[PDB]
């Protein structure tokens, strides 16, 4: 699992904002159809999104830039 | 006692109550305050509408769950529609204003 | 002091006052008031002190 | 979709617009074909089809016809649920008045017509006539005419005369009215009616008329002409088993209305005598009023039973109404309850969940995941597979549950730690397993308690459970930052036993190579767990920028401490496990780990502590036996001695040498002393043992007695309970509150005889009955405090203010009971903390004071820090993060979107069932310091107190106060400022009675106006015959002297009149009545001599409740309403008069000081605003007015923290200031200034504050105001939302007031978004609302 | 009730607040097994159809 | 058969359970000395004495 | 007057007893319902009937003043009747 989310909160800087960004990413990953930016060690999309946030690979700006690129293409 | 979905009341279309009726758990004010003390606004919203008496938002939730898509379209509780009808059946004119 | 502040001088006025207190607004009558008082207590049917 | 809910009165055209048809028959359904009748209250051509997609005749039965009206019956073919939405209407034969707008106490109809309610009712019930625009024939509009007067006035008046009776007359009055012309007349009158009551009434009425004009309503709409009819499915006629029917009470009321309306219509066509039609109209009015609001003016209406019928108003209001019950307290799917067991093997984030309860809660997930892996072709197949409980279903369930939290909740949710999220672990059985360390959060034990479990469904809900509510994120108490996950009772016993030395055990004196060798020696039986040895210990310290430098040394410790060291993480020192480790040492150790290392180390460490404690508590084999309760050997001797003493006192009393009241206290004290002696003997015989030895000599050590081990470690119990086990039960009470003189001299190891048991039963039942009252009263306070403070949210980062409270340690007379660290930790500084040398800034500014800063402040020994407070924040509609401080549950500065009001309310309220409604001797050593002290050298050079606010503080060597003693006026201090003192060094003494009168210089005194037998009396000591002239009060003295004021001005030997030394005014010191002038008349005296000698709180929860409700004390202390010189004037006028003629200012201020009062100010004295004149309980409202806002908040927090501190409760002061911020949020305007507000008006402080700030930036001036203090009830009452207010106030009053005002609601509080069913604007939903506001501004 | 052989001691946190630890020999010997009788009813009514 | 927690006795001053446990141990001890004499088929004279 | 005296204590204690109210009640004969009407009129400013001797104030002054004025009228009243059957008989 993931007993604590301290590092992801440290990255994002607000706890409520972490909950929103992680939910957006997890929805992209489960229903939209996307590939994890980290190995999926038998983890649910919620935990995978959280541990992508932990490593600085995802945040609101990054999600937004990628989505605007997709809209252009 | 555990319940997922069951029978519903006639006027207030809310989960029935008890084990015989296979009812649900009562979620009251002191538990609402507890969720407000956290920031859990989506948990509160789904406990008030999709899980209790949002009639057409509770079947969509079931279909979404059996589709592997964990998302809700809340809508409006039926405890508020009945309230509007009861206030309007007095002489008062209470209406929802356009966005 | 109770006598000096007594609004009554005769039995009939007392019965009329009791009648008004119990069922106010009705025309007081000597026979009616006497019957009401005599039936309130002192009547085997309506009052039993076991 | 919708962004506001607007409310207003309904026009008859609108009511007909709602309706789909008119109800004309009182019929409901046919009694054989149970089908709806043609034009009744359950019709199908008005309210819709009773079966989906079918007519009633049956011609159209297939959806292919959706949307056509069958001509055999006119029943549109559509969904039957449309029957739940369609309204009807009833055309009344006569207009009828709405009861809400007629019989609401302000009586909007009467207020609008300026007509008393009795006249309106008389005209309404056909008792008298009225004039509606009588015209130019000597008539007066709105004039009441009795029937005979109307008859005789009709004569000689061939004019129409415009007189009417009944509700049609009222409707005509309202319809003929003009509001703008009334406003014009009212303005004209207010032009030249400058009279208090008159202009007040004119302003009130013009305000009401203007509000009604703006609302858009028309007054004639308050009189009903069409009556709406509710949709049938909200008042159903459901069939039951056996042919019985159940119906709603509204059907009876509607049938009543329809029957009487039809009868009236029929009776109008028969031209009946007017008596009959009048009576019918009265009945119709009664029926409609019973429908709308039953038993509001009449007595009631009853059905088949004798119970009153439930009306439309009864379905919204009450404690069961929709505006209450359903809308925040409804039943929920995906939930279930069960019993809780221990499960000691679990980790803090995991709970044990029964497999059967989980196969039901997660059923749709299982169906989906079965169909997605091909196990089940369709969903019905999956439903049968799970029903048969196949083998693959358990694997799929284990996959579904893998990472999916579940919320667990225990009954009374008193704070937010009563709901927590855990990861399930599927188990056998039917009971939930709960991690032990969480029990304290739930206040849960394992003797039959139950818990409810809910499952989050959405992705956001799961993420909130994992990130906000998970149990491993919540290890600190939100009330105080202290950990709430401390080991409780058996872990404590095990860890105490492990780390506990003894004199001579196996393997003493050994030298080990580390903890591993210590453990290897103990498990092999070669060493005892309590064996003093020397062990090579390696400890890391972050004595750098986070480096963890290692140090290896040879510590002296037992085997158990070295073993326990193996679970401690790196960064901690070794002294934490190098003690006996009772209950509080372990909590201190966990707090140290959390503050040094972080959150994950703390969670791992706590689990390891629990495991080790359980293991070694099992290992010790600790038990409880009867020999463990050791009774003292001298108990009977002490009891015999006390019995002899009480017998001697009793026999002396029988000789009449001591009164019964005094002998009662004598016996009570004797028995209290005996009880103390017995307890001391017991505890001294119990707490120590003798053990022999290293060499062979006796040695004393702490006992290993099981009861003493449990009590000493803090595992369970206390010395008070051991006293009742081995000592004596003690002294009981009585139902009257008295203390029975004879105690229960037996303990439970012995037996109580029948009389002693009968005595004990009273206390038990009393306690059992109390507990319940305490619970019910703590709930009231919490509900009221969340009603007041619910919508307070952190909405900003930094308001940029420079003001705040001044934190210093709180000292009550003697020692300090709360240092500066506890009060200042976690807050933000408002000003630079200068080093006590005044050299440079120690903490610059805007620095969150965490532990390191507080340690630095302790190093510099500074005891006064100015910190930013919520109550003094510049933010509008919210609070900034810097003025709040830090979270206290997370350990860092707070985040925007945090419901700080709900947290404050819950933190104050939850610890309330644990609160029960109950000369100077410088102890330490330091340089005495004085404050506000005026004095003059006495005869022996000793000081004399000449100040009413004198203060003495035992400033210590470093300059930090350690004691604060208020110096009584008129007293002399042996030592002086700077004079070092010592123990018991009574710095000063004073008469316990009689306020002394002192002068200033040595000189003769003339008794001017002090005439004996006129103004004073010759009460010369009768025995010693020493002059004792006594001032006589107005009545006490002669009438001539009554006007005369007794004066004792000082006079010099020159025969001149001494002027107050240092002042031009003569040294006259007028003495008031009773003044003890033992001095002889015209006698010379010394400096500051005794010219004369004038003769001499609840507790608990009710104390806290009446402190938040701003209640004025019964004997309010009087204060200085202004600075100046005191005086007096027209006395005996029932109340003595006072004045404070300002030195230069005018208006000396006069006051009606009740004579029975005892003033503290000499008739000739100067004072400053906020100075005690009389004395007694201070009133919060006075403090706010005379002294600033910071001086009322400091009073409430200190006054309300005394109740909690006395009981051992600990809650932060942040939480009391957010409640106080909500109390003083209304401001009264003093000068309208250049703003747009009237003077005598109350407005929101946040509104006037920004109105003049914007005005000031322009070329205008601001409006002055005076702040107001309200209790948590009135403050709540002032909500600007009729939906939020209708929830917790009177629904009928809220909705009538909002309808006539044409109010509109825009959902921005937490209680109005819960009812409407959308995201609250507080937490994760705080970003949604902000973007909504952005789009709306767009 | 039944006469149970009882020992007073902690034993590993399985009797932490008021929890009780029981042997399997108490469950094998059927010391606290109880018999519960319940009645269910089926009523056949005459409906309109 | 059953393991109970000692920490529940001190706070809840119901020490009748400890005395009941001690006396039940005594009674069961008496019962176990008769089971032995009745299983070693001993004469009534010896069972009558104990 | 008599009603004002009854109010005096109501406020002084914050509560009253059925007996004291009924007694201070104006001799004005009341037909039960009238007594019922006044009890609420007094309840308007807020009071505890409590057949026995004795929980916060939430009453708007506007309600209070209006209840006071109607309370004064009750004393000046003669035969106010809020009962249709009684009115019919008369
Ligand atoms: Mg319990
Ligand atoms: Zn048809
Ligand atoms: Zn601020």
């Amino acid at each position: 699992a993931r007993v604590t989310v301290q590092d992801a909160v440290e990255k994002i800087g607000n706890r409520f904002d972490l909950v929103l960004v992680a939910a957006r990413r997890a929805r992209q990953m489960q229903v939209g159809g996307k590939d994890p930016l980290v190995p999926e060690e038998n983890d649910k999309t919620t935990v995978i999104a959280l541990r992508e946030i932990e490593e600085g690979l995802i945040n609101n700006q990054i999600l937004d830039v990628r989505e605007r690129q997709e809209q252009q293409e | 006692h555990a319940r997922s979905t069951g029978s519903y009341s006639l006027v207030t279309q809310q989960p029935l109550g008890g084990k015989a009726q296979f009812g649900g758990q009562r979620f009251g004010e002191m538990e609402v305050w507890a969720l407000e003390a956290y920031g859990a606004a989506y948990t509160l919203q789904e406990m008030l509408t999709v899980k209790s008496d949002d009639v057409n938002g509770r079947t969509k939730m079931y279909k979404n769950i059996v589709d592997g898509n964990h998302q809700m379209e809340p809508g409006m509780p039926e405890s508020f529609n009945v309230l509007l009808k009861e206030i309007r059946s007095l002489g008062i004119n209470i209406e929802l204003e356009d966005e | 002091e109770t006598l000096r502040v007594d609004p009554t001088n005769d039995r009939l006025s007392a019965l009329v006052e009791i009648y008004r207190m119990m069922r106010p607004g009705e025309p007081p009558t000597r026979e009616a008031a006497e019957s009401l008082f005599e039936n309130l207590f002192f009547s085997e049917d309506r009052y039993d002190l076991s | 979709e919708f962004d506001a809910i607007k409310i207003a009165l309904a026009s008859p055209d609108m009511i007909r617009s709602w309706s789909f048809g008119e109800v004309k028959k009182p019929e409901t359904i046919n009694y054989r074909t149970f089908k709806p009748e043609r034009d009744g209250l359950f019709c199908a051509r008005i309210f819709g089809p009773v079966k989906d997609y079918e007519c009633l005749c049956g011609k159209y039965k297939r959806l292919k016809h959706r949307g056509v009206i069958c001509e055999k019956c006119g029943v549109e073919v559509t969904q039957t649920k449309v029957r739940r939405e369609r309204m009807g209407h009833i055309e009344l034969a006569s207009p009828t008045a709405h009861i809400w707008f007629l019989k609401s106490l302000p009586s909007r109809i009467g207020l609008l017509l300026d007509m008393p309610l009795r006249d309106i009712e008389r005209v309404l019930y056909f008792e008298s006539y009225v004039v509606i625009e009588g015209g130019m024939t000597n008539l007066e509009r709105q004039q009441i005419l009795t029937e005979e007067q109307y008859l005789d006035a009709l004569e000689e008046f061939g004019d129409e005369f415009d007189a009417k009776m009944g509700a049609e007359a009222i409707q005509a009055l309202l319809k003929s009215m003009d509001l703008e012309q009334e406003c014009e007349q009212l303005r004209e009158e207010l032009n030249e009616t400058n009279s208090e009551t008159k202009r007040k009434k004119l302003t009130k009425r013009i305000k009401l008329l203007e509000a009604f004009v703006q609302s858009g309503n028309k007054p004639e709409w308050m009189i009903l002409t069409v009556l709406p009819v509710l949709p049938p499915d909200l008042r159903p006629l459901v069939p039951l088993d056996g042919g019985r029917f159940a119906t709603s009470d509204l059907n009876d009321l509607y049938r009543r209305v329809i029957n009487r309306n039809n009868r009236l219509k029929r009776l109008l066509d028969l031209a009946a005598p007017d008596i009959i039609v009048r009576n019918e109209k009265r009945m119709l009015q009664e029926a409609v009023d019973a429908l709308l609001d039953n038993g509001r003016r009449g007595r009631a209406i009853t059905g088949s039973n004798k119970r009153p019928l439930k009306s439309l108003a009864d379905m919204i209001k009450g404690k069961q109404g929709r505006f209450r019950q359903n809308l925040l307290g409804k039943r929920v799917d995906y939930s279930g309850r069960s019993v809780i067991t221990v499960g000691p093997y679990l980790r803090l984030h995991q709970c044990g969940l029964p497999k059967k309860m989980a196969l039901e809660l997660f059923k749709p997930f299982i169906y989906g995941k079965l169909e997605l892996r091909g196990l089940a072709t369709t969903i019905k197949a999956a439903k049968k597979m799970v029903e048969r409980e196949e083998a693959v279903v358990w694997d799929i369930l284990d996959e579904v549950i893998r990472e999916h939290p579940v919320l667990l909740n225990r009954a009374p949710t008193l704070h937010r730690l009563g709901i927590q999220a855990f990861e399930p672990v599927l188990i056998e059985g039917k009971a939930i397993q709960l991690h032990p360390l969480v029990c304290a959060a739930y206040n849960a034990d394992f003797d039959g308690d139950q818990m409810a479990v809910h499952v989050p469904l959405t992705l956001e809900a799961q993420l909130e459970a994992r990130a906000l509510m998970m149990s491993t994120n919540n290890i600190l108490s939100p009330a105080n930052g202290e950990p709430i996950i401390v080991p409780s009772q058996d872990v404590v016993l095990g860890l105490y036993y492990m780390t506990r030395d003894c004199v001579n055990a196996k393997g003493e004196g050994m030298v080990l190579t580390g903890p591993k060798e210590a453990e290897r020696l103990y498990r092999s039986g070669l060493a005892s767990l309590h064996a003093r040895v020397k062990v090579r210990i390696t400890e890391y310290e972050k004595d750098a920028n986070g480096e963890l430098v290692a140090k290896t040394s040879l510590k002296d410790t037992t085997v158990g401490r070295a073993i326990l060291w193996m679970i401690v993480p790196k960064g901690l020192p070794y002294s934490i496990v190098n003690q006996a480790l009772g209950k509080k040492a372990i909590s201190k150790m966990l707090n140290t780990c959390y503050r040094i290392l972080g959150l994950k180390p703390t969670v791992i460490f706590a689990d390891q502590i629990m495991y080790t404690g359980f293991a070694y508590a099992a290992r010790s084999g600790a038990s409880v036996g009867i020999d463990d309760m050791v009774i003292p050997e001298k108990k009977h001797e002490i009891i015999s001695e006390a019995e002899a003493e009480v017998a001697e006192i009793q026999e002396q009393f029988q000789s009449g040498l001591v009164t019964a009241g005094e002998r009662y206290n004598k016996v009570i004290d004797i028995w209290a002393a005996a009880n103390d002696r017995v307890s001391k003997a017991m505890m001294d015989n119990l707490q120590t043992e003798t053990v022999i030895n290293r060499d062979g000599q006796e040695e004393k050590q702490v006992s290993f007695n099981s009861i003493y081990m449990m009590a000493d470690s803090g595992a369970r119990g206390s010395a008070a309970q051991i006293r009742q086990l081995a000592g004596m039960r003690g002294l009981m009470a009585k139902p009257d509150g008295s203390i029975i003189e004879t105690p229960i001299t037996a303990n439970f190891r012995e037996g109580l005889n029948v009389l002693q048991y009968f005595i004990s039963t009273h206390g038990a039942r009393k306690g059992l009955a109390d507990t319940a009252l305490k619970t019910a009263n703590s709930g009231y306070l919490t509900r009221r405090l969340v009603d007041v403070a619910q919508d307070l949210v952190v909405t900003e980062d930094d308001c940029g203010t420079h003001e705040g409270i001044m934190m210093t340690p709180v000292i009550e007379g003697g020692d300090v009971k709360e240092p500066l660290r506890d009060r200042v930790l976690g807050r933000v500084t408002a000003e630079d903390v200068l080093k006590p040398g005044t050299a440079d800034i120690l903490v610059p500014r805007n620095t969150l004071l965490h532990e390191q800063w507080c340690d630095l402040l302790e190093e510099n020994s500074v005891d006064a820090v100015k910190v930013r407070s919520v109550v003094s924040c510049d933010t509008d509609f919210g609070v900034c993060a810097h003025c709040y401080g830090r979270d206290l549950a997370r350990g860092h500065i707070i985040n925007k979107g945090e419901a700080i009001g709900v947290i404050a309310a819950q933190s104050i309220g939850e610890p309330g069932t644990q609160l029960t409604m109950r000369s100077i001797q410088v102890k330490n050593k330091g340089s005495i310091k004085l404050s506000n002290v005026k004095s003059v050298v006495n005869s022996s050079g000793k000081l004399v107190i000449t100040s009413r606010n004198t203060e003495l503080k035992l400033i210590d060597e470093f300059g930090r106060t350690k004691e604060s003693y208020k110096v009584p006026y008129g007293a002399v201090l042996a030592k002086g400022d700077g004079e070092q003192v010592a123990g018991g060094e009574t710095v000063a003494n004073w008469d316990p009675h009689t306020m002394p009168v002192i002068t200033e210089v040595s000189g003769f005194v003339r008794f001017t106006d002090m005439i004996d037998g006129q103004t004073i009396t010759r009460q010369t000591d009768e025995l010693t015959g020493l002059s004792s002239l006594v001032v006589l009060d107005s009545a006490e003295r002669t009438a001539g002297g009554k006007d005369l004021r007794p004066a004792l001005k000082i006079v010099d030997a020159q025969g001149n009149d001494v002027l107050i030394p240092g002042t031009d005014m003569p040294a006259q010191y007028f003495l008031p009545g009773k003044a003890i002038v033992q001095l002889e008349d015209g006698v010379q005296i010394s400096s500051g001599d005794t010219l004369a000698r004038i003769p001499q709180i609840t507790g608990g929860l009710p104390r806290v409740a009446d402190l938040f409700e701003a209640r004025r004390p019964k004997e309010p202390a009087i204060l200085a309403e202004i600075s100046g010189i005191v005086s007096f004037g027209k006395e005996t006028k029932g109340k003595r008069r006072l004045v404070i003629t300002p030195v230069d200012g005018s208006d000396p201020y006069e006051e009606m000081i009740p004579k029975w009062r005892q003033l503290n100010v000499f008739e000739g004295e100067r004072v400053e605003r906020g100075d005690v004149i009389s004395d007694g309980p201070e009133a919060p409202h006075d403090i706010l007015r005379l002294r600033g806002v910071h001086a009322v908040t400091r009073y409430i927090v200190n006054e309300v923290q005394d109740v909690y501190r006395l009981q051992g409760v600990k809650i932060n002061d942040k939480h009391i200031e957010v409640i106080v911020r909500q109390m003083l949020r209304k401001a009264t305007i003093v000068n309208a200034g250049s703003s747009d507000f009237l003077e005598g008006e109350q407005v929101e402080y946040s509104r006037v504050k920004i109105a003049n700030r914007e005005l000031e930036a322009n070329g205008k001036v601001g409006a002055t105001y005076s702040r107001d203090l309200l209790g948590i009830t009135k403050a709540s009452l002032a909500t600007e939302s009729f939906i939020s207010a209708a929830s917790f106030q009177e629904t009928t009053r809220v909705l009538t007031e909002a309808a006539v005002a044409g109010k509109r609601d825009e959902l921005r509080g937490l209680k109005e978004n819960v009812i409407v069913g959308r995201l609250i604007p507080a937490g994760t939903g705080y970003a949604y609302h902000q973007d909504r506001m952005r789009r709306r501004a767009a | 009730g039944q006469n149970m052989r009882v020992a007073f001691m902690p034993w590993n946190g399985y009797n932490f607040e008021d929890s009780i630890l029981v042997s399997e020999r108490v469950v094998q010997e059927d010391r606290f097994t109880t018999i519960h009788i319940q009645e269910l009813a089926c009523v056949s009514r005459d409906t309109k159809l | 058969d059953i393991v109970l927690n000692p920490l529940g006795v001190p706070s809840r001053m119901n020490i009748g359970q400890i005395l009941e446990t001690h006396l039940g141990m005594a009674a069961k001890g008496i019962g176990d000395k008769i089971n032995a004499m009745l299983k070693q088929q001993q004469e009534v004279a010896k069972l009558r004495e104990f | 007057s008599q009603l004002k005296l009854l109010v005096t204590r109501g406020k002084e204690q914050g509560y009253l007893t059925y007996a004291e109210v009924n007694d201070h009640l104006p001799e004005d004969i009341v037909d039960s319902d009238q007594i019922e009407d006044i009890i609420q009129m007094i309840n308007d400013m807020g009071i505890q009937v409590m057949e026995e001797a004795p929980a916060e104030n939430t009453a708007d002054e506007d309600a209070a003043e209006a209840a006071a004025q109607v309370l004064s009228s009750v004393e000046s009243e003669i035969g106010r009747t809020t009962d249709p059957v009684r009115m019919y008989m008369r």
Side-chain angles (χ1 to χ4, degrees), chain D residues 1321-1334:
Chain D
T1324 314
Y1326 179 85
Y1328 169 80
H1329 285 259
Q1330 247 52 30
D1331 80 43
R1332 287 173 58 266
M1333 298 179 184
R1334 165 185 321 166

Side-chain angles (χ1 to χ4, degrees), chain D residues 242 342 344 436 445-447 488-490 614 617-618 622-623, chain E residues 7-19 45 48:
Chain D
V342 202
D445 59 335
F446 304 114
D447 60 10
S488 310
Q489 56 192 238
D490 183 13
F614 281 151
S623 184
Chain E
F8 282 89
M9 52 171 294
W11 212 90
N12 284 130
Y14 279 104
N15 45 241
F16 168 56
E17 294 282 11
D18 300 324
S19 277
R45 312 176 177 271
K48 64 183 64 49

Side-chain angles (χ1 to χ4, degrees), chain D residues 55-60 70-75:
Chain D
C55 182
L56 197 78
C57 73
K59 288 182 50 182
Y60 309 78
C70 155
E71 339 77 16
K72 187 173 167 187
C73 12
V75 178

Side-chain angles (χ1 to χ4, degrees), chain D residues 717-732:
Chain D
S718 59
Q721 284 138 339
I722 277 62
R723 184 183 307 163
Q724 305 179 19
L725 256 54
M728 61 170 49
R729 221 216 171 284
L731 212 60
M732 300 303 300

Side-chain angles (χ1 to χ4, degrees), chain D residues 796-801 868-870 872-875 878-884:
Chain D
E796 198 180 9
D797 197 328
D798 196 3
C799 67
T801 189
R868 296 178 64 170
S869 173
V870 172
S872 67
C873 183
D874 290 356
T875 303
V879 165
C880 70
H882 278 65
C883 288
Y884 187 79

Side-chain angles (χ1 to χ4, degrees), chain D residues 665 700 751 869 949 1234 1271:
Chain D
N665 293 16
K700 309 288 193 168
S869 173
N949 302 167
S1234 186

